[PDB]
A paper describes a structure:
Analysis and comparison of its structure with structural homologs indicate that [name] belongs to DNA-mimic Acrs that directly bind to the cascade complex and hinder the target DNA from binding to the cascade.
The crystal belongs to space group P3112, with three molecules present in the asymmetric unit (ASU). The final structural models contain residues Met5 to Ser76 for molecule A and Met5 to Glu78 for molecules B and C [Fig. 2(a)]. The results of this analysis indicate that the surface of [name] is highly acidic [Fig. 2(d)]. Therefore, this highly acidic surface feature may indicate that [name] is one of the DNA-mimic Acrs. Moreover, the long α2–α3 connecting loop and C-terminal loop exhibit a relatively high B-factor value (average of 54.3 Å2) compared with the low B factor (average of 40.2 Å2) of the overall structure. This indicates that although a major part of [name] is rigid in solution, it contains a relatively flexible α2–α3 connecting loop [Fig. 2(f)]. We performed SPR spectroscopy to confirm the interaction between [name] and the cascade. As shown in Fig. 4(c) and Table S1 of the supporting information, [name] binds to the cascade complex with a KD value of 4.32 nM.
Author numbering: 5 to 75
Write the structure that this text describes.
Amino acid sequence: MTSFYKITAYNSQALYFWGTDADVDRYVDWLNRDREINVYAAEAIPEAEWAQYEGRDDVLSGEECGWDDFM
């Protein structure tokens, strides 16, 4: 169910997420809600690379309660 996700957009800063794909999709939708250009899209990161994301401070975690309060 849950995975690390890399969320990218042309000419934009990469974002990083941990959680379910339903939650990464809600997150991407909120990121794009007012993006006229260079919209974001997510890709699921294979477990082989997961160490390079675990504990990272730029990874928004959907498994934390209230992570989506700003939505």
